[PDB]
Amino acid sequence: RVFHLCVCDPLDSILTSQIYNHIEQIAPNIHVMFKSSQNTEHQLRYQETEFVISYEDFHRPEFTSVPLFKDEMVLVASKNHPTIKGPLLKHDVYNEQHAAVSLDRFASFSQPWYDTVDKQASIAYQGMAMMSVLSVVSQTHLVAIAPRWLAEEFAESLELQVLPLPLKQNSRTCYLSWHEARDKGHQWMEEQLVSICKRLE
Amino acid sequence: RVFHLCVCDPLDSILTSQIYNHIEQIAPNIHVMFKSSQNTEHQLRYQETEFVISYEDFHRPEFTSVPLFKDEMVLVASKNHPTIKGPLLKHDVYNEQHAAVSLDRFASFSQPWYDTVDKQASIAYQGMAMMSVLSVVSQTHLVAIAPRWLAEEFAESLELQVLPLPLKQNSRTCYLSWHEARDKGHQWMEEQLVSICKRLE
């Protein structure tokens, strides 16, 4: 039995290792495959994907979304930054140079905070994934917006300072979603995923 | 003057910080913007992109490709792996579980080593970028194929062992490409990029 999960970036960098390590320990015929990339409805219904973990909530009755956890969104910068020695004021955020997840990406994590021409002009680097964004931030004077859990996990490794985000959209809730249609394996996997993620909390 | 570069993953994680840090020091009206994502011809000719850095070589006369450096491709695994305590034999490589860059990605770095159904079945995690792949490898028993320079840069931070790749396609050359058509700024930037990359060598 192979379970196909789509864990959207950057939630894959937060949750994948925890899910994989726990579900690998169970049995030799139980496996879990991960993607991080069609729309959710096409993925769930018409493709192997059985679960989606993302920041998007489905109130659509044919689908069921379960909230997993809420997290703060933070600004990150190198601990070696020449000028940033603490939190930025609201009016200075976009006077820095930013690294962000490519806005061309299908479900870009960064899109909510660069929804104007002015804000987008501050982006000097667009990477494919948040871990690419964090690695460039750790080697440059660029700043980025990331989930607090991810930033704190790699703060020591990549030498990052983790700062409050003085924007109003400073939190996000990630959800577990699936198509309500449902064998025993799928019901079982639902409860394991909910427990793994909430246990990490 | 703003220069638009497309540095294809994982070469952005190798080169972006070096290019940005050097070209930022120069002047306040000289800037460089990075993407890592149309085809190269559309990007170069018909879009803001002025240079492409990738593992692809253009012998097409209208375009000019300059080799920057050759690098070894290696296997990476967590230093905490329960069984991997050295290089893998050719016949054991694909008996491990792999993390790789999504094969759906336009120019997936990992595609050359997963070109069969058998090889692809060994992939348990598909991420959007090589830095996402390395971070999951550092937290799991999964293995991945990465450029040696990138693996060695983060070997200590992410606690990775860097192993020879017993495959025949174990090296790649990255090139600087552009559309031969060419102001003084573009000619200048060409020489800086060649010097920055070869200096890093």
CA A198 to chain centre: 16
Report CB contact under 8 Å: B20, A157. Answer: no
Q: Is B190 exposed, middle or buried (0-12, 13-18, 19+ CB in 10 A)?
A: middle
The three-state secondary structure class of A150 is helix
Q: Distance between CA atoms of B181 and A83, rounded to whole angstroms? A: 41
Cα of A92 to nearest chain B Cα, Å: 18
Joined together, the tokens standing for residue A189 give 């996997």
Contact A99, A141 (CB under 8 A): no
CA–CA min distance A34, chain B (Å): 5
In DSSP notation, A13-74 reads: HHHHHHHHHHHHTT-SS-EEEEE----HHHHHHHSS--EEEES-----TTEEEEEEEEEEEE
For residue A12, the chain B residues in CB contact (below 8 A) are 125, 127, 132, 136
Say whether B36 and A127 touch across the interface (CB within 8 A). yes
CA separation for the pair A119, A93 (Å, rounded): 10
Distance from CA of A196 to the nearest CA of B (A): 15
Residue of B21, B97, B125 to mutate, testing the A interface (most A Cβ within 10 Å of its Cβ) = B125
Q: How many residues does chain A have?
A: 201
What six digits make up the tokens of B135? 């971070």
* d(C-alpha A175, C-alpha B24), whole Å: 40
Locate B124 and state its tokens: 């348990």
B159: left (phi over 0), alpha (psi -120 to 50) or beta: left
How is B120-174 classified by DSSP, letter by letter? HTTEEEEESSHHHHHHHHTTSS-BEEEEHHHHHHHTTTTTEEEEE--SS--EEEE
Count Cα neighbours of A60 within 13 Å in the Cβ-side half-sphere: 11
Handedness of CA B52, B58, B60, B64 (dihedral sign): positive
The two tokens of residue A39 are 């729309």
Model resolution, angstroms: 1.9
Q: Which residues pair with A52 in a beta bridge?
A: A6, A177
Identify whether the C-beta of residue B80 lies closer than 8 Å to the C-beta of residue B170.
no
Tell me phi and psi for residue A16, to 5 degrees.
Answer: -55, -50
Which residue in A124, A131, A141 is closest to B34 by CB distance? A124
Structure tokens at B84: 């991997």
Q: A178 with A58: CB under 8 angstroms? A: no
